[PDB]
């Protein structure tokens with residue numbers, strides 16, 4: 001799990017220090033999922049509509065078998081047992097030419113509907129190859145937020161996914177500046193931004209708050225002053241001095 | 246004109262004014278809050294600093310943008326102006342949208358014009374069959390018109406069902422494009438524009 | 443609209459009868475179908491009310 | 492008609508909706524896109540988080556559908572031999588329809604074998620459960636039940652009801 | 655009326671298309687929980703919008 005944090009922008013430091021708080025949050029979060037499916041069965045709606053549609057299509061096909069189609073009766077055995085041979089073919093041919101149209105309509109609709117299922121099936125295969133077998137940097141693909149990992153589960157004629165996400169909670173206000181020059185040379189951060197506590201200045205990562213002292217191990221030097229618009233005066237450390245004494 | 250036979254249109258659920266409010270909301274968010282509001286609460290940030298992160302993720306150091314801030318600003322404004330003028334060129338850019346409207350007119354016009362075909366009867370008006378023929382000899386002619394107009398109706402509906410599949414395929418592509426190109430930064434090549442994003 | 447002296451009927455793009463000249467006073471008219479449409483019912487669920 | 496703005500539960504058209512509330516009647520209004528909000532902006536102001544939360548979300552996708560098969564001559568003609576003779580005048584309608592329905596049935600087994608069969612071997616969880624404080628009792632199989640299903644899977648199995 | 659249910663079969667198919675149109679436009683635009691507004695002062699370091 002530490003490597004998952006490192007791939008989102010947060011260092012390994014945070015996970016180890018707050019291990020107990022994270023584990024309790026995760027275990028409690030799973031419990032809500034089971035309860036959330038005990039509400040009215042509107043969560044499983046997507047899987048139910050597929051089954052219902054195939055029910056209506058099949059029933060209408062049977063109901064068409066009780067239509068005269070302009071003949072005198074809707075039963076073949078009645079016609080064959082009331083009319084002579086040479087007068088039968090006139091009435092039978094009207095029933096045949098009507099039942100073929102009904103059968104063709106059923107098959108044509110099934111071919112179109114089968115295309116939608118395949119299109120959705122291809123999406124599921126991709127999701128099982130990126131979200132659950134690795135870590136994805138795509139936005140809003142494996143859930144809402146920053147992706148961590150996923151687990152699959154089975155269901156009748158379908159699949160149900162579970163996503164895990166990292167989301168910021170509380171925020172503060174600070175003052176920031178582009179760069180600072182100390183001995184006539186501009187200084188820039190390596191990974192982070194400058195934050196003004198009110199009297200001093202610090203360097204911290206973007207996605208978490210951890211103030212640090214500005215040294216030469218966190219900055220690189222390039223150019224002189226009066227080129228950047230918002231340069232600020234401050235001091236650096238250069239930690240080689242104390243042993244020089 | 247004159248609403249012809251039993252054809253209706255029905256109005257869309259979301260009016261054009263309501264759609265313009267979502268687009269305004271998205272533009273306001275990306276300028277002020279960067280990409281933070283795509284996942285979680287929005288956090289403010291200065292715009293020049295936000296553009297610095299974009300340069301970092303493409304493989305260019307933050308040094309470049311600050312030292313040439315004036316030059317970059319003028320180039321961006323000049324590029325925008327060319328877009329507006331170029332849309333006043335030959336109506337080829339808007340070709341994709343105008344093709345959809347034209348196809349619907351042809352489909353609907355053909356259906357209406359099919360009502361004036363004899364299909365093998367004496368005439369093509371229901372009343373004339375009733376007015377000039379006896380009841381027992383009229384059901385034979387009417388049964389020819391009824392079967393003719395059902396084939397015309399089923400043909401139109403089947404075409405619409407297929408055509409609705411293409412539109413849905415295009416709609417799903419736009420939804421994915423919005424979730425990646427505008428609410429974040431993507432490393433996929435040639436997905437959002439031609440070049441680095 | 444105005445017509446020709448020998449003109450008697452009138453149509454549209456969908457070749458439908460739209461106007462007729464009066465046979466007894468050579469005056470003009472218009473013919474349009476009158477109101478029709480569908481009806482829909484709004485319900486909140488038979489359980490609630 | 493009322494002046495207030497609400498959400499959408501029963502659509503009507505052109506931005507009107509209907510809902511049941513409380514005496515008790517039916518109301519009509521105009522929908523609301525969402526709560527209005529503004530963000531403070533400045534050229535030297537920034538915001539940084541300090542605490543985090545962990546959530547879980549679910550998605551549901553269909554995979555396959557039930558297969559069907561219909562005999563051409565049996566349905567439209569019955570068992571009478573006199574009927575069947577007149578059907579042969581039409582050339583190949585019966586064989587044309589059967590091929591179309593058989594292609595769908597074969598395709599369905601391809602869809603389910605392409606979304607689940609992605610591992611060469613079969614792995615087994617270790618007998619002892621120790622993951623540094625992480626509990627996975629709602630996903631792993633339960634040996635007590637007659638069939639190897641997880642508690643989450645069992646709850647889903649009875650929720651969907653299928654002559 | 656001799657034909658069984660041709661009229662009702664066609665109407666159901668056309669209604670499904672009409673509903674799907676509203677679903678398409680909702681899934682491409684309605685992606686924000688709240689609505690934001692721009693500050694009155696337009697000074698973004700040199701970019702003109």
Ligand SMILES: *[C@@H]1O[C@H](CO)[C@@H](O[C@@H]2O[C@H](CO)[C@@H](O[C@@H]3O[C@H](CO)[C@@H](O)[C@H](O)[C@@H]3O)[C@H](O)[C@H]2NC(C)=O)[C@H](O)[C@H]1NC(C)=O
Nearest residue numbers: 027028030031620621622624625626627628629633641642
């Ligand atoms: C991992 O979590 C699961 C569930 O969150 C733990 O198993 C469950 O633990 C609860 C403890 O309350 C058991 O509840 C039982 O209730 C009866 C009611 O009479 C009571 O008599 C028992 O003494 C017990 O409290 C529950 O049966 C048990 N199993 C399930 C399926 O919920 C599990 O202990 C956790 N693992 C670890 C290592 O902590």
Ligand SMILES: *[C@@H]1O[C@H](CO)[C@@H](O[C@@H]2O[C@H](CO)[C@@H](O[C@@H]3O[C@H](CO)[C@@H](O)[C@H](O)[C@@H]3O)[C@H](O)[C@H]2NC(C)=O)[C@H](O)[C@H]1NC(C)=O
Nearest residue numbers: 321322323325326329330695696697698699700701702703
């Ligand atoms: C952001 O860019 C827009 C677009 O250039 C700027 O608006 C433009 O401002 C100039 C200022 O003079 C306008 O020029 C004037 O146009 C009128 C038109 O009748 C003309 O009579 C005057 O003699 C003068 O040339 C220009 O029209 C206006 N719009 C456009 C499309 O160019 C805007 O000022 C820029 N924002 C800032 C803060 O500068």
Ligand SMILES: *[C@@H]1O[C@H](CO)[C@@H](O[C@@H]2O[C@H](CO)[C@@H](O)[C@H](O)[C@H]2NC(C)=O)[C@H](O)[C@H]1NC(C)=O
Nearest residue numbers: 170171172173174288289530531532536537538
């Ligand atoms: C400080 O952070 C808080 C919370 O994000 C915000 O305070 C708001 O400030 C604006 C004007 O600056 C006021 O109109 C709001 O009423 C404040 N809200 C609250 C809850 O206090 C804002 O982001 C930051 N404000 C300052 C001045 O730094």
Ligand SMILES: *[C@@H]1O[C@H](CO)[C@@H](O[C@@H]2O[C@H](CO)[C@@H](O)[C@H](O)[C@H]2NC(C)=O)[C@H](O)[C@H]1NC(C)=O
Nearest residue numbers: 174195196197198199200201202209210211212
């Ligand atoms: C922010 O600045 C304040 C003062 O402006 C700091 O408070 C003191 O800082 C000095 C630094 O020399 C420490 O020796 C003191 O122990 C601090 N506390 C007090 C009560 O004097 C503060 O530490 C700075 N940082 C933060 C995060 O507030």
Ligand SMILES: *[C@@H]1O[C@H](CO)[C@@H](O[C@@H]2O[C@H](CO)[C@@H](O)[C@H](O)[C@H]2NC(C)=O)[C@H](O)[C@H]1NC(C)=O
Nearest residue numbers: 018020021022024025028169170541542543544
């Ligand atoms: C970050 O948030 C967590 C929970 O949202 C905080 O942990 C809780 O803090 C409250 C404060 O009194 C305690 O009562 C709870 O027992 C803590 N645990 C839980 C599970 O709620 C945590 O303190 C926050 N971190 C900071 C630095 O404020």
Ligand SMILES: *[C@@H]1O[C@H](CO)[C@@H](O)[C@H](O)[C@H]1NC(C)=O
Nearest residue numbers: 229230231533534535697699
């Ligand atoms: C920020 O805006 C203020 C206007 O209130 C301006 O005086 C100041 O110079 C700006 N800062 C920079 C670095 O341009």
Ligand SMILES: *[C@@H]1O[C@H](CO)[C@@H](O)[C@H](O)[C@H]1NC(C)=O
Nearest residue numbers: 181182225230231232233234
């Ligand atoms: C930083 O120091 C230089 C050195 O003289 C001075 O000119 C400049 O005004 C100082 N900047 C600030 C913000 O005090």
Ligand SMILES: *[C@@H]1O[C@H](CO)[C@@H](O)[C@H](O)[C@H]1NC(C)=O
Nearest residue numbers: 492493494495496519520521
């Ligand atoms: C609601 O709208 C009607 C429409 O004219 C108006 O007359 C009425 O005063 C409004 N009521 C309120 C409380 O705004």
